[PDB]
Amino acid sequence: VVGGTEAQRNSWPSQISLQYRSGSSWAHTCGGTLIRQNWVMTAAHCVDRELTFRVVVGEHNLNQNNGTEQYVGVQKIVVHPYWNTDDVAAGYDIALLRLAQSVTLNSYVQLGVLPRAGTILANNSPCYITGWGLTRTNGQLAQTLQQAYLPTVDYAICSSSSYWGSTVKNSMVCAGGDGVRSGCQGDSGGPLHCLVNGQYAVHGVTSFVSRLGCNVTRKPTVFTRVSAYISWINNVIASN
Numbered sequence: 001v002v003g004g005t006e007a008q009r010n011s012w013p014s015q016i017s018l019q020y021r022s023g024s025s026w027a028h029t030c031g032g033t034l035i036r037q038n039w040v041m042t043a044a045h046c047v048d049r050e051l052t053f054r055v056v057v058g059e060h061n062l063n064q065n066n067g068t069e070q071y072v073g074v075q076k077i078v079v080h081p082y083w084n085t086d087d088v089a090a091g092y093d094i095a096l097l098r099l100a101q102s103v104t105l106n107s108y109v110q111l112g113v114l115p116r117a118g119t120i121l122a123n124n125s126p127c128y129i130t131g132w133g134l135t136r137t138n139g140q141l142a143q144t145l146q147q148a149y150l151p152t153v154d155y156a157i158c159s160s161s162s163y164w165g166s167t168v169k170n171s172m173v174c175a176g177g178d179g180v181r182s183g184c185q186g187d188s189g190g191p192l193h194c195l196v197n198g199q200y201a202v203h204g205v206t207s208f209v210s211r212l213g214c215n216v217t218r219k220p221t222v223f224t225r226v227s228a229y230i231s232w233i234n235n236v237i238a239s240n
């Protein structure tokens, strides 16, 4: 997250760190949202590589013991069947990870609330992106979870010529674009939390940013629209 502020430890308890084994160690690669005690919603592109993954819930500082972490293997990965790694702009950048064990819920580990199917937010709706991704374009990962206020940019504006044009689809949510705050590499897969009827819900799964850089004016961060996938999500959970 570029131009973020450090999140309070108990702010975003559905945020997870998706990590892959790297030698004798584990490296953060993407975010995710805990949606059941044994399921995590993330981006499909986060799990294209044939790597060994684990999920960390209750995480705050990647590099220090917080006293609140639970570590769990990924047992099954279900990518959306229409995802095509060659074509992020086509959409479908979403995957569900079934965890090897159910995690324990507490102040630091909670299920992410999802929107009702089909819900579209009005332009400029209040949302926060959270994650441990790069804090600058071509920078380094955050040590502590970051949040940035990123108001939505509705489809009509987001798919206009000076914004994303044809690259953005109605199956996506755009947010931000102010040239200062943005998602960045390593936030992919994580939540965009939007306030609706008094309650934050996870409306987006971070998907992509401009090839030109993370915080680019009129190139808001782009998220898979969760509310476009509620049936798919329910179907996968029910059959696994």
Ligand SMILES: [Ca+2]
Binding pocket: 059, 060, 061, 062, 063, 064, 065, 066, 069
């Ligand atoms: Ca930690």
